[PDB]
Amino acid sequence: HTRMFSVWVNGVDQGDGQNVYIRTPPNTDPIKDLASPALACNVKGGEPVPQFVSASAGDKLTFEWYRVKRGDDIIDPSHSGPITTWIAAFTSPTMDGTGPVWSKIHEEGYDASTKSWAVDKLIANKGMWDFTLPSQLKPGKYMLRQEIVAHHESDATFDKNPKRGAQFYPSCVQVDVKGVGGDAVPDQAFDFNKGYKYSDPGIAFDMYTDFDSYPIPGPPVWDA
Ligand SMILES: [Cu+2]
């Protein structure tokens, strides 16, 4: 359980973004069903919010998360897993992020040399998660998606045992990307409902074994 409070642009807080520029779900509940339409942008994913974070291609964005209250424990430390960030063109206001539209722009999984997960790091940095908007990115409106996945019950899959399974916590953010050049259009066209499967070693993952590493689902980070 966790959701986003706000976005920071080059370390400057843009202010409470819930129902402003963040497509904030009603609560912190996990998505577990891979066929759910909510997988991409959570339960209110298709409802426009009125504002776009203003950022430049190349900027460092920070997404700030919380649990119940801004600046709390952020997420239960039981919930180890990766954090992935994605981008999609903002096709129209009532997009819900379903279909083949997404390109992965950042990922952290398991760092074996420290034996910490992306979520461990999220907690130690008090819910601040940093990534870069690619500088080659063609200016325009986009949806940014950041997703926490908790694997404390991923030793079962949801299809076999509905009371268990990987828990997905996606957050979709409206961004208006100011240009500086950049010609590059995200073109992985990844589709969470088709592309995430129960057979995925990164989804069917047992964290109660002597594993040395973790295969993060979906394609490698996009380049061009
Ligand atoms: Cu939870």
mmCIF file of C-alpha atoms and ligand atoms in Angstrom:
data_model
loop_
_atom_site.group_PDB
_atom_site.id
_atom_site.type_symbol
_atom_site.label_atom_id
_atom_site.label_comp_id
_atom_site.label_asym_id
_atom_site.label_seq_id
_atom_site.Cartn_x
_atom_site.Cartn_y
_atom_site.Cartn_z
ATOM 1 C CA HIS A 1 0.000 0.000 0.000
ATOM 2 C CA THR A 2 1.305 3.355 -1.246
ATOM 3 C CA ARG A 3 0.544 6.194 -3.704
ATOM 4 C CA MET A 4 2.012 9.415 -5.068
ATOM 5 C CA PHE A 5 1.813 12.784 -3.370
ATOM 6 C CA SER A 6 3.614 15.017 -5.875
ATOM 7 C CA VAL A 7 6.262 15.436 -8.602
ATOM 8 C CA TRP A 8 9.474 17.421 -8.227
ATOM 9 C CA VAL A 9 11.230 19.027 -11.235
ATOM 10 C CA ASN A 10 14.988 19.461 -10.779
ATOM 11 C CA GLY A 11 14.460 19.223 -6.986
ATOM 12 C CA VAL A 12 11.610 21.757 -6.898
ATOM 13 C CA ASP A 13 8.309 20.454 -5.522
ATOM 14 C CA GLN A 14 5.401 21.164 -7.929
ATOM 15 C CA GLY A 15 2.983 20.762 -4.983
ATOM 16 C CA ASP A 16 0.255 18.250 -4.183
ATOM 17 C CA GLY A 17 -0.540 16.669 -7.514
ATOM 18 C CA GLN A 18 -3.279 14.171 -6.474
ATOM 19 C CA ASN A 19 -6.276 14.739 -8.893
ATOM 20 C CA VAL A 20 -4.285 17.621 -10.311
ATOM 21 C CA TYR A 21 -1.616 16.123 -12.549
ATOM 22 C CA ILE A 22 -1.586 12.643 -10.931
ATOM 23 C CA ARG A 23 -4.380 10.189 -11.876
ATOM 24 C CA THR A 24 -4.760 9.361 -8.185
ATOM 25 C CA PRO A 25 -6.714 6.160 -7.326
ATOM 26 C CA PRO A 26 -9.345 6.329 -4.535
ATOM 27 C CA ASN A 27 -7.016 4.383 -2.109
ATOM 28 C CA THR A 28 -3.626 2.472 -1.897
ATOM 29 C CA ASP A 29 -5.074 -0.998 -2.795
ATOM 30 C CA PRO A 30 -2.835 -3.243 -4.980
ATOM 31 C CA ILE A 31 -3.664 -4.365 -8.567
ATOM 32 C CA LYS A 32 -3.058 -8.128 -8.869
ATOM 33 C CA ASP A 33 -5.177 -9.323 -11.821
ATOM 34 C CA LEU A 34 -2.981 -9.143 -14.979
ATOM 35 C CA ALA A 35 -6.145 -8.846 -17.123
ATOM 36 C CA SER A 36 -7.409 -5.815 -15.149
ATOM 37 C CA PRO A 37 -7.642 -2.533 -17.096
ATOM 38 C CA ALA A 38 -6.377 -0.859 -13.882
ATOM 39 C CA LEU A 39 -2.919 -2.532 -14.300
ATOM 40 C CA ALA A 40 -1.662 0.321 -16.433
ATOM 41 C CA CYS A 41 -2.850 3.478 -14.683
ATOM 42 C CA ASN A 42 -4.713 2.135 -11.620
ATOM 43 C CA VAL A 43 -8.573 2.252 -10.912
ATOM 44 C CA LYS A 44 -9.129 5.900 -12.017
ATOM 45 C CA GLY A 45 -6.711 5.578 -14.946
ATOM 46 C CA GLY A 46 -9.173 6.697 -17.601
ATOM 47 C CA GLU A 47 -10.340 9.887 -15.803
ATOM 48 C CA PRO A 48 -8.512 13.017 -17.007
ATOM 49 C CA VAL A 49 -6.947 15.288 -14.435
ATOM 50 C CA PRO A 50 -6.776 18.957 -15.435
ATOM 51 C CA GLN A 51 -3.053 19.813 -15.218
ATOM 52 C CA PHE A 52 0.305 18.723 -16.718
ATOM 53 C CA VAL A 53 3.622 18.877 -14.886
ATOM 54 C CA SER A 54 5.759 21.305 -16.824
ATOM 55 C CA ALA A 55 9.226 19.774 -17.448
ATOM 56 C CA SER A 56 11.957 19.903 -20.096
ATOM 57 C CA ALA A 57 13.394 16.969 -21.990
ATOM 58 C CA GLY A 58 16.494 16.118 -19.876
ATOM 59 C CA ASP A 59 15.084 17.185 -16.496
ATOM 60 C CA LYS A 60 15.384 15.086 -13.361
ATOM 61 C CA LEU A 61 11.922 14.242 -12.084
ATOM 62 C CA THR A 62 11.308 13.040 -8.600
ATOM 63 C CA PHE A 63 8.029 11.184 -7.868
ATOM 64 C CA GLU A 64 7.196 11.414 -4.113
ATOM 65 C CA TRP A 65 5.220 8.502 -2.551
ATOM 66 C CA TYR A 66 3.440 8.038 0.778
ATOM 67 C CA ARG A 67 1.397 5.474 2.720
ATOM 68 C CA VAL A 68 -1.407 7.276 4.700
ATOM 69 C CA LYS A 69 0.104 10.716 5.218
ATOM 70 C CA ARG A 70 2.788 12.724 3.370
ATOM 71 C CA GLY A 71 6.223 11.911 4.946
ATOM 72 C CA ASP A 72 5.302 8.688 6.758
ATOM 73 C CA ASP A 73 6.775 5.188 6.315
ATOM 74 C CA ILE A 74 5.798 5.290 2.627
ATOM 75 C CA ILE A 75 5.141 1.568 2.245
ATOM 76 C CA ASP A 76 5.301 -1.529 4.415
ATOM 77 C CA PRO A 77 8.922 -2.797 4.385
ATOM 78 C CA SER A 78 7.472 -6.321 3.777
ATOM 79 C CA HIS A 79 6.770 -5.180 0.189
ATOM 80 C CA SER A 80 10.213 -5.689 -1.440
ATOM 81 C CA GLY A 81 10.417 -5.373 -5.224
ATOM 82 C CA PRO A 82 11.345 -3.253 -8.260
ATOM 83 C CA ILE A 83 10.335 0.198 -9.358
ATOM 84 C CA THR A 84 9.874 0.865 -13.078
ATOM 85 C CA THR A 85 9.072 4.095 -14.845
ATOM 86 C CA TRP A 86 7.388 4.179 -18.271
ATOM 87 C CA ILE A 87 6.263 6.729 -20.875
ATOM 88 C CA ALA A 88 3.429 6.853 -23.425
ATOM 89 C CA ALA A 89 2.254 9.613 -25.714
ATOM 90 C CA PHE A 90 -0.798 11.418 -24.314
ATOM 91 C CA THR A 91 -3.100 10.356 -27.185
ATOM 92 C CA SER A 92 -6.279 12.000 -25.793
ATOM 93 C CA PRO A 93 -7.622 12.987 -22.337
ATOM 94 C CA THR A 94 -9.638 9.751 -21.780
ATOM 95 C CA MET A 95 -6.738 7.398 -22.469
ATOM 96 C CA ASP A 96 -6.437 4.867 -19.616
ATOM 97 C CA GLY A 97 -2.970 3.611 -20.648
ATOM 98 C CA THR A 98 -4.259 0.275 -21.927
ATOM 99 C CA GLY A 99 -3.123 -1.090 -25.325
ATOM 100 C CA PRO A 100 0.351 -1.137 -26.948
ATOM 101 C CA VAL A 101 1.681 2.307 -26.044
ATOM 102 C CA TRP A 102 4.441 2.116 -23.329
ATOM 103 C CA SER A 103 8.254 2.445 -23.366
ATOM 104 C CA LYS A 104 10.365 1.731 -20.269
ATOM 105 C CA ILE A 105 12.590 4.722 -19.411
ATOM 106 C CA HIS A 106 13.998 3.654 -15.979
ATOM 107 C CA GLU A 107 14.187 0.532 -13.735
ATOM 108 C CA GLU A 108 15.633 -0.593 -10.436
ATOM 109 C CA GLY A 109 15.192 -4.173 -9.249
ATOM 110 C CA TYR A 110 17.533 -6.006 -6.950
ATOM 111 C CA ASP A 111 21.144 -4.846 -6.452
ATOM 112 C CA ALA A 112 22.987 -8.012 -5.441
ATOM 113 C CA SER A 113 26.126 -6.226 -4.096
ATOM 114 C CA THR A 114 24.007 -4.532 -1.341
ATOM 115 C CA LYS A 115 21.124 -7.075 -1.285
ATOM 116 C CA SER A 116 18.621 -4.231 -1.425
ATOM 117 C CA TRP A 117 15.529 -3.826 -3.548
ATOM 118 C CA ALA A 118 14.278 -0.698 -5.199
ATOM 119 C CA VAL A 119 11.592 -0.489 -2.454
ATOM 120 C CA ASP A 120 14.261 -0.585 0.291
ATOM 121 C CA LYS A 121 15.819 2.440 -1.385
ATOM 122 C CA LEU A 122 12.443 4.188 -1.816
ATOM 123 C CA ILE A 123 11.987 3.890 1.978
ATOM 124 C CA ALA A 124 15.518 5.076 2.900
ATOM 125 C CA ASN A 125 15.013 8.153 0.592
ATOM 126 C CA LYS A 126 11.641 8.877 2.365
ATOM 127 C CA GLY A 127 9.550 8.043 -0.709
ATOM 128 C CA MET A 128 11.540 10.168 -3.167
ATOM 129 C CA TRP A 129 12.106 8.318 -6.439
ATOM 130 C CA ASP A 130 14.333 10.023 -9.085
ATOM 131 C CA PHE A 131 14.646 9.446 -12.825
ATOM 132 C CA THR A 132 15.581 11.448 -15.913
ATOM 133 C CA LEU A 133 13.238 12.417 -18.764
ATOM 134 C CA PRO A 134 15.342 11.462 -21.835
ATOM 135 C CA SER A 135 16.872 14.592 -23.468
ATOM 136 C CA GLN A 136 16.196 13.156 -26.986
ATOM 137 C CA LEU A 137 12.471 13.069 -26.167
ATOM 138 C CA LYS A 138 10.301 14.806 -28.725
ATOM 139 C CA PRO A 139 8.373 17.650 -27.035
ATOM 140 C CA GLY A 140 4.709 17.072 -26.432
ATOM 141 C CA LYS A 141 2.296 15.723 -23.855
ATOM 142 C CA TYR A 142 3.005 12.337 -22.325
ATOM 143 C CA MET A 143 1.752 10.064 -19.552
ATOM 144 C CA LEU A 144 4.531 8.934 -17.199
ATOM 145 C CA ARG A 145 3.902 5.725 -15.345
ATOM 146 C CA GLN A 146 5.737 4.669 -12.252
ATOM 147 C CA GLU A 147 5.021 1.305 -10.726
ATOM 148 C CA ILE A 148 6.018 -0.342 -7.481
ATOM 149 C CA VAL A 149 5.755 -4.114 -7.397
ATOM 150 C CA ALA A 150 5.673 -5.999 -4.024
ATOM 151 C CA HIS A 151 6.701 -9.622 -4.096
ATOM 152 C CA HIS A 152 6.118 -10.700 -0.439
ATOM 153 C CA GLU A 153 3.383 -12.975 -1.798
ATOM 154 C CA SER A 154 4.760 -13.604 -5.362
ATOM 155 C CA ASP A 155 5.743 -17.201 -4.488
ATOM 156 C CA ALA A 156 2.200 -17.872 -5.744
ATOM 157 C CA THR A 157 0.582 -16.386 -8.861
ATOM 158 C CA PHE A 158 -2.841 -14.676 -8.771
ATOM 159 C CA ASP A 159 -4.370 -17.100 -11.412
ATOM 160 C CA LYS A 160 -3.588 -20.146 -9.108
ATOM 161 C CA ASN A 161 -4.065 -18.484 -5.610
ATOM 162 C CA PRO A 162 -6.087 -15.225 -5.716
ATOM 163 C CA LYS A 163 -5.280 -14.386 -2.085
ATOM 164 C CA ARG A 164 -1.576 -14.149 -2.990
ATOM 165 C CA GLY A 165 0.450 -12.989 -6.007
ATOM 166 C CA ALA A 166 2.574 -9.947 -7.020
ATOM 167 C CA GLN A 167 1.041 -6.617 -6.009
ATOM 168 C CA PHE A 168 1.293 -3.764 -8.556
ATOM 169 C CA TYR A 169 1.049 -0.121 -7.482
ATOM 170 C CA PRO A 170 0.998 2.020 -10.653
ATOM 171 C CA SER A 171 0.841 5.826 -10.702
ATOM 172 C CA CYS A 172 0.155 7.760 -13.937
ATOM 173 C CA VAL A 173 1.276 11.369 -14.233
ATOM 174 C CA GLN A 174 0.352 13.945 -16.946
ATOM 175 C CA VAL A 175 3.452 15.704 -18.242
ATOM 176 C CA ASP A 176 3.923 18.466 -20.785
ATOM 177 C CA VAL A 177 7.490 18.165 -22.086
ATOM 178 C CA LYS A 178 9.143 21.399 -23.187
ATOM 179 C CA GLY A 179 11.591 20.800 -26.040
ATOM 180 C CA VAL A 180 15.286 21.537 -26.425
ATOM 181 C CA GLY A 181 15.619 19.436 -29.543
ATOM 182 C CA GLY A 182 14.892 15.708 -29.153
ATOM 183 C CA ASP A 183 13.354 13.894 -32.143
ATOM 184 C CA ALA A 184 12.843 10.536 -30.406
ATOM 185 C CA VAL A 185 9.337 9.081 -30.052
ATOM 186 C CA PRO A 186 8.897 6.163 -27.578
ATOM 187 C CA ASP A 187 8.261 3.139 -29.719
ATOM 188 C CA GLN A 188 8.431 -0.038 -27.626
ATOM 189 C CA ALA A 189 4.593 0.073 -27.718
ATOM 190 C CA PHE A 190 4.439 -2.261 -24.715
ATOM 191 C CA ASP A 191 1.034 -3.372 -23.435
ATOM 192 C CA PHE A 192 0.901 -4.289 -19.744
ATOM 193 C CA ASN A 193 -2.151 -6.604 -20.061
ATOM 194 C CA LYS A 194 -0.608 -8.576 -22.917
ATOM 195 C CA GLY A 195 3.081 -8.261 -21.905
ATOM 196 C CA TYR A 196 2.909 -9.082 -18.211
ATOM 197 C CA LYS A 197 2.233 -12.806 -17.743
ATOM 198 C CA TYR A 198 2.009 -15.184 -14.775
ATOM 199 C CA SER A 199 4.787 -17.265 -16.372
ATOM 200 C CA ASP A 200 7.208 -14.315 -15.997
ATOM 201 C CA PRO A 201 10.068 -15.270 -13.605
ATOM 202 C CA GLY A 202 9.918 -11.569 -12.508
ATOM 203 C CA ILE A 203 6.180 -12.008 -11.560
ATOM 204 C CA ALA A 204 6.260 -15.587 -10.387
ATOM 205 C CA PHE A 205 9.166 -14.816 -8.060
ATOM 206 C CA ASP A 206 9.999 -16.542 -4.741
ATOM 207 C CA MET A 207 11.897 -14.058 -2.483
ATOM 208 C CA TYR A 208 12.121 -16.712 0.291
ATOM 209 C CA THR A 209 15.075 -18.505 -1.429
ATOM 210 C CA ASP A 210 18.808 -17.861 -1.916
ATOM 211 C CA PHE A 211 18.321 -15.891 -5.156
ATOM 212 C CA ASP A 212 21.185 -13.744 -6.353
ATOM 213 C CA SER A 213 19.210 -11.612 -8.767
ATOM 214 C CA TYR A 214 15.880 -10.587 -10.080
ATOM 215 C CA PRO A 215 14.701 -10.375 -13.761
ATOM 216 C CA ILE A 216 12.676 -7.144 -14.122
ATOM 217 C CA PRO A 217 9.598 -7.766 -16.373
ATOM 218 C CA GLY A 218 9.197 -6.115 -19.767
ATOM 219 C CA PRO A 219 11.809 -4.890 -22.261
ATOM 220 C CA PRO A 220 15.140 -3.283 -21.410
ATOM 221 C CA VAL A 221 15.133 0.482 -21.024
ATOM 222 C CA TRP A 222 14.406 2.253 -24.303
ATOM 223 C CA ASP A 223 17.283 4.112 -26.082
ATOM 224 C CA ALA A 224 16.979 5.954 -29.467
HETATM 225 CU CU CU B 1 0.371 -3.222 0.590
#
